[PDB]
Ligand binder design. Structure first.
Ligand SMILES: CCCCCCCCCCCCC/C=C/[C@H](O)[C@H](N)CO
Ligand SMILES: CCCCCCCCCCCCC/C=C/[C@H](O)[C@H](N)CO
Lengths: 48, 51, 287, 96, 246, 246, 49, 287
């Protein structure tokens, strides 16, 4: 979760809102096992 | 570990060709620093990036 | 320095390659030394032996102890499952999935349940026949669909491309398929008894269907088809035999005397409890 | 490698505004902003990350994740936030 | 130098003048998790004397028809003391226990109690239903009784469908009213994972059962309780968060 | 290498890009009680990472008429986290604190806040009554405000009858909105006795006061909060018993 | 903005214990990831009537 | 070995026997070095000195620093109390008790309250005179009644046997009595400010009379009589002067600018607050 610690405080004459961009990654500790086939793909007929 | 005196043989090839063989010999080599941190001036974790 | 209060197992292992010998022992007439008297209230078994109870001879004992290890006891193939693939006329699916649970057949189930925790490898053999029995020359596909992987929706559906899932292609006329499987549990051992719930939350007192179901045992699904375009007319069963090898076991527990009912639950009859030993006419007649 | 979590993945997020987390000056202090589950191989904002695609070819994963937030404001915009992580348990925290 | 024992843990201590040795389950002592077996990276908390100490439940009174009781651990302790609080704020729990059972009576009484420690003790639905839909299951208040304990419907099959006679495989002891008035077992942490959730999962149950029933001739004391006192040796907690009772 | 700081305590951590050094009250670090100074014989408990860590109160919003707020320590923490639980089950508490105050605004705002640490901070009745019978006293909810904080009726005399201008004797810092957005003070355990009761006695209060008022020209942000984050460095507890909230 | 990923680690963010980590890294190499047979094509030979 | 994670002050002291000297300093013309600019937001005071602000001469400074130590500042006798013994006609008690609280008289109170914690010894002098002023040749008894000890109920009552309680016998015509008293606190220091309550329980929000009263300061009672059988007709006051010696002090705090009201409470007027500095006509006229 991401909470307001204090507030987004802005002077006059400046835009009244902004955007955070979030990114994600792994550390040196990260591993995986038992390779399988993904769920995102779907095919119906042979691609021509 | 363990496996005392298991006499393993795999990579032995029956053909005169190198591509007839079986994978791998593995590899443990990694270089994440080329994709993850490909910057000229190196940046420490202690220091702030931009000064 | 300024704050001071800040600043093993008794049992050991021994190789036993044969049954125990017997040393000669003569009588004893004296007080103070009493091998017979035990007190079982300490939970420890009587340590009294052959040789302090009677007079014995000398027996060099070359009987072998080897066959009773958990490796030899548990390395045998026995049926863990049966899969019915119609594929025939009328309503035709064209494939059948079997979730992998080896608790479905009692004979191999009671051997495993002697132990709470087990870590092993496996050898699976797939014996497929037709309805009555026979082998025709039809090609088969045995595919492993690990947890999270798409299950195939049809005979020809794309999930059979198996660019990743391991699969076996075999003819009904070929000797039965066989593969080795590793220890795939995300914990450190399989456990056949889990006293607990998989998730948090408020648990119904009327019906708890989630009680006792360990997550760590969910290995995915096994799926069969007939490799083909149109369909076959045959109907076939695949029997699935699992052998345990390189097996280790922990924390032995009593052997189940009551008839099993369900795969995943130790439910037994509150009525109808069967006695563990058959009944005789009187306690004074041994026979 | 860090790729972009799609936290605004909700509906009516149009096309490319799904990647942005709106921050503005609040009224009631101590307010929530955005929330997402940590499971990288699960449907959600991790479904657009590279690490989300590769852990999805495998049955299991282990390790430490990392979540990087980049604020694009004006130079004159100031603020503080609280990025909190709660291990499994009762549902999403109600308060800061 | 045997029948007299004292146990001191924390600010609590237990004396007994009549005791039969002490059982150390599976020949091991409780211990902290070694760096090689551990997985979670964050640092566990180790309160020592505030958690590790003897807690004493209410006493179960002892009758001629009594079929025997059971408890679940840590579950009995999740609402009590500082041990109950740490287990609510942390997602990851590990420790052992020292179990002590007090039942006394007089040289004109008789009976025996089986005291056992059952790792992964699973209760079982009672019914003839073979369909997993219509088949009965026990309720949460049964599976996890709490401080109040539970009782056996069928003490012979141990409610799990397994014969009581073979319960002597688990670390056990007997209270035989002519011999000893207490039974003490020291349980190591047993589990297939190094840490676990104290709330969702109970490591092992305790079991007190009358294999031989209580008998006394009229005029003697009819009221015999069974008291239970348990201490969490070597506790650790990890994964600190907000409080969850269940 | 100065204005940028990170503080890591427990599973919590704090970053600030705008900071004025750090104050270490009276030139000492918090520490555990030495064997020579201690008196109580029983063994204290030392949870470390579960207690010592940053707790964050609600934010006090910042206006033109605001007279300033105060808190009491440990009192603000007696109901929160594992720190609040240990302080209820133990009769004897000792530790220090690390105090951090966040207030930010924009280069068109202005003001200053006095942040101080007052050992043995005694509030005072307000009235002309010279008879100890008819003379007024403050209420418990005033003396010990809790998490919600309290406010000054007379910020000039600090509600204790003492001039604010001399508050710079206590370990302090200023938040000057053109200079720094945070103030951090690390308080050792101060008291005339090595241990004390967290419930009956508060070691010191915290004070945030507008010496120079907030000003902003129209069109800028009207809402400025003041957030407080405090960590209990080096905690000990003794005299374990049942739970007492007050 | 430098295109480089955060180098911050477990150990500088919180207080950690010591973990000897024997999890294997081996199965994820491009050799093991790509060595599996999967269908690249289907060919229909009528030859019939 | 198996679990690894299980496995000072910057300020120092210096003797100062005299005021600081002054070294010669010439001008500076250069950038980068700026002694004047300070930032007070760090709570630290400006370290700028005489010699970097202007050009100075050399001053060997033999001014003494000694008189300002807490020993010399606090070792003086000043009035901590006054006791009125009627003993005369009409209603006659025949004795008077005075609970020992040195906060009753403002002039010595404000010196002590510069500090939160104090540990000292004491020298008490008892100056007794008659109603207007005089000394007659009457015998007196000054008795110390520590906490828990029986307070005397009458002029002749048995509690004056003082087989244990220390007492002083003195004639009004003798030089004033004097004794040394140790540090008797059951804590490790006296404290003039206690933010807290002496006991547990539920505290009234309407009136808290127990707020701020430290137990550790309760030293017992001082009691006077005229040693006699019948009674005297005189009326006398005893003034009580306390000197502090061997004194140590901790944690300095601001000096009180508001008028005191009560002994045991820092109650001040919410109306009527007096400014700490007198007011002038304009900020632009220094005079
Ligand atoms: C080509 C087909 C290969 C099929 C591979 C299947 C391997 C699955 C792992 C088997 C390991 C033992 C099964 C798990 C234990 C019990 O069934 C659990 N009770 C399941 O709930
Ligand atoms: C022969 C008569 C001897 C009288 C001896 C009396 C000695 C009493 C100890 C005095 C020490 C300082 C007094 C205590 C401090 C303040 O009064 C506290 N606020 C009391 O509430």
């Amino acid at each position: 979760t991401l909470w307001y610690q204090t507030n987004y405080v802005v002077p006059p004459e400046t835009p009244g809102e902004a955007y955070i961009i979030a990114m994600g990654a792994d550390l040196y500790k990260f591993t995986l096992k038992i390779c399988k086939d993904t769920d995102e793909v779907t095919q119906q007929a042979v691609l021509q | 570990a363990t496996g005392g005196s298991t006499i393993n043989f795999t990579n032995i090839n029956y053909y005169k060709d190198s591509y007839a063989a079986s994978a791998t010999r593995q590899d443990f080599t990694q270089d994440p620093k080329k994709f993850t941190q490909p910057v000229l001036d190196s940046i420490r974790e202690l220091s702030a990036p931009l000064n | 320095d300024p704050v001071e209060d800040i600043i093993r197992a008794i049992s050991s292992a021994t190789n036993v390659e044969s049954a125990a010998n017997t040393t000669p022992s003569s009588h004893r007439l004296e007080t103070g030394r009493v091998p017979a008297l035990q007190a079982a209230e300490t939970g420890a078994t009587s340590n009294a032996t052959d040789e302090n109870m009677i007079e014995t001879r000398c027996v060099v004992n070359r009987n072998g102890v080897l066959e009773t290890t958990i490796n030899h006891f548990f390395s045998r193939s026995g049926l863990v499952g049966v899969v019915n693939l119609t594929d025939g006329g009328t309503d035709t699916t064209g494939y059948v999935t079997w979730d992998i649970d080896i608790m479905g057949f009692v004979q191999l189930r009671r051997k495993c349940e002697m132990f709470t925790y087990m870590r092993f490898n496996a050898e699976f053999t797939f014996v497929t026949t037709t309805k009555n029995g026979e082998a025709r020359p039809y090609m088969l596909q045995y595919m492993y669909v690990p947890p999270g992987a798409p299950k195939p929706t049809g005979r020809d559906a794309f999930q059979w491309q198996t660019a990743t899932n391991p699969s076996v292609f075999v003819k009904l006329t070929d000797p039965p398929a066989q593969v080795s499987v590793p220890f795939m549990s995300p914990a450190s051992a399989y456990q056949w008894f889990y006293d607990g719930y998989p998730t948090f939350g408020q648990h119904p007192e009327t019906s708890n269907t989630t009680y006792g179901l360990c997550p760590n045992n969910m290995m995915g699904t096994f799926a069969v088809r007939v490799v083909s375009r149109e369909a076959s007319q045959l109907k076939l069963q695949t029997r699935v035999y699992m052998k345990l090898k390189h097996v280790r076991a922990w924390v032995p527990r009593p052997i189940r005397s009551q008839p099993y009912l369900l795969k995943n639950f130790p439910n037994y009859d509150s009525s109808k409890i069967t006695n563990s030993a058959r009944d005789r006419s009187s306690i004074k007649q041994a026979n | 490698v860090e790729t972009i979590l799609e936290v605004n993945n909700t509906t009516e997020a149009t096309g490319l505004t799904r990647l942005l987390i709106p921050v503005s000056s609040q009224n009631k202090a101590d307010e929530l902003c955005a929330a997402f589950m940590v499971d990288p191989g699960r449907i959600g904002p991790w479904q657009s990350t590279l690490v989300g695609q590769i852990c999805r070819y495998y049955t299991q994963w282990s390790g430490s994740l990392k979540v990087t937030f980049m604020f694009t404001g004006s130079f004159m915009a100031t603020g503080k936030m609280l990025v909190a992580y709660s291990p499994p348990g009762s549902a999403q925290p109600a308060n800061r | 130098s045997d029948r007299v024992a004292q146990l001191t843990v924390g600010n609590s201590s237990i004396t007994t003048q009549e005791a039969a040795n002490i059982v150390l389950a599976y020949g091991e002592w409780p211990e902290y998790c070694p760096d090689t077996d551990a997985t979670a990276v964050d640092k566990p908390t180790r309160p020592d004397v505030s958690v590790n100490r003897f807690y004493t439940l209410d006493s179960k009174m002892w009758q001629e028809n009594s079929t025997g009781w059971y408890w679940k651990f840590p579950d009995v302790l999740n609402k009590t003391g500082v041990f109950g609080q740490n287990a609510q704020f942390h997602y990851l729990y590990r420790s052992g226990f020292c179990l002590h059972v007090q039942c006394n009576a007089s040289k004109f009484h008789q009976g025996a109690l089986l005291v056992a420690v059952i790792p992964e003790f699973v209760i079982a639905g009672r019914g003839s239903n073979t369909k997993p839909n219509e088949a009965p299951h026990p309720g949460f208040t049964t599976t996890f009784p709490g401080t109040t304990g539970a009782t056996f419907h069928d003490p012979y099959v141990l409610d799990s469908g397994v014969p009581l006679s073979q319960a002597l495989i688990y670390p056990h002891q007997w209270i035989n009213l002519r011999t000893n008035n207490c039974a003490t077992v020291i349980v190591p942490y047993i589990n297939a994972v190094p840490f676990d959730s104290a709330i969702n999962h109970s490591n092992f149950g305790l079991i007190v059962i009358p294999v031989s029933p209580l008998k006394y001739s009229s005029g003697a004391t009819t009221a015999i309780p069974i008291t239970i006192t348990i201490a969490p040796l070597n506790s650790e907690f990890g994964g600190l968060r907000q409080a969850v009772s269940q």
